[model samples]
Target: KVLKIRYPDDGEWPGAPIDKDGDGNPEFYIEINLWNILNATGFAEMTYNLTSGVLHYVQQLDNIVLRDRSNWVHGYPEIFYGNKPWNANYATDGPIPLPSKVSNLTDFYLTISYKLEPKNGLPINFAIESWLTREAWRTTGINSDEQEVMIWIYYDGLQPAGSKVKEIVVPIIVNGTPVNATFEVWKANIGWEYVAFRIKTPIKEGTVTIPYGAFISVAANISSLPNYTELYLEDVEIGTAFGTPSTTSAHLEWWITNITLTPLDRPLIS
Candidate 1:
């Protein structure tokens, strides 16, 4: 059975209406409070389907009418009846609007890759490797002076695990050839759970203009126990002139933080 209702102000003849107040006649106005509209309002009368366990509401509105409505009708329906004063006095408002233009452009060119793996009750060892060319001018805007590239690794339980052994086998390569460079590493722990490794490499002299390029690699071993581990690679820091503060120092100053780990035989990049 279905029941249809039309407001008396709509100029439509009234049909059979539900006796909401139990006076045995009919009610003109259905007292729908705000809570009922938000939590329970639905479509016309329909039997509950026990087999499918579904409760369907058939009061779908016309999509075209809703799409064509003005912003005032769509957002502040209560304002149509001069009720905006009630909401305007509140202590807090809603979300703000988006910006018309973006501010930072350097973020668009940066690319980063990272991964994590779990080894359940088995000893694991793996190596991470990367290869790329370097351009000095693009990084620092200086062509004659040496530059530096710094990598950082942050980890948990690093005290007992000890410092990571980094081998700087060769200088940076440019244009399919190798150039002279220097590398170094530093370790520190701020608290019981936080530890860090700072890797630095100096760009060699004898370059007309510097370009941006470098290869990076990290390896790990976790075979003694069965547990979960995580590793994070923060942003790499590059400097145009030698003997400047390391990337780790720069990151700390800028509040750039990271955490990292080594997982079994899987490649860190993969």
Candidate 2:
């Protein structure tokens, strides 16, 4: 018995340009499906294109969740199961809250750590820069009057065993453009096993729109003695109401079934 399959066309689909900002470069998005036919489980993999809007199919699925216009605004933790604990407490467990009264947000955790070697000297300098924005706040309860942007950093000292750490720098970006202002933190006197750091900053009022889809880009720089270097960045995280509503009051669920990607000319039941 033949099976029918369908897929996205080469040039037709919603996608951002590889070089949308005129950087003179191309990017490609590749779709990958992690499926287990025998056991029936997996998720679709999406790779961002650096140039064109077309997304190439690196892997296809016979049964999987497919992304569409209606679900694109949803957050990843809501879409994927393994992203967070089922009964996570958003109030006390670390998600930055929407500002209550146009106040700046402070004490959001940003942590990074690394090991070092003796005779290799410790880090002398380090820097981190992050860009954050929300695309659509109406769905997430963010208001135009609330504060909605922030940057943070922390630093640790070197150990006696030869591992060392440096300070952190935070660069500011406004309206999609970089600015000259910066915030920095420095540490001294320590050695090499594991050095850790943290930073917190408040979302400034009137910075960006709230409740919109948000993107965060981070870059870090570190310098060590004897030409050794270490730079670390934590993965970005966000929380919001971007998922299917639960049928029962206690649980939420969404599913996709019988999915296939193939050429239009192919027919399974002829």
Q: Give the local distance difference test score of model 2.
A: 0.22
Off by over 4 Å in 1: 1-167, 179-182, 192-201, 204-229, 232-266
**RMSD per model, one decimal:** 29.3, 22.8
- Give one digit per residue, the lDDT tens place, for model 1 in 1-270: 323332222222222322334464322111111111111112222122333322121221111122221111111000010001111111111111110011110111111122222122111111111111122112122111211122332111112123544444334333335555433332223211212223233212212111111222212121121111122221222111100111111000001011111122323221
Measured by lDDT, the strongest candidate is 2
| Candidate 1 worst ten-residue window by lDDT | 75-84
* Clash totals, every prediction: 17, 32
Off by over 4 Å in 2: 1-62, 70-75, 78-89, 93-104, 107-109, 112-270
TM-scores of the candidates in the order shown: 0.20, 0.20
C-alpha lDDT of all candidate models, in order: 0.20, 0.22
Report the C-alpha lDDT of model 2 over 76-136, residue by residue, as the tens digit: 2111111111122111112333211111222232322211111122111121221111221
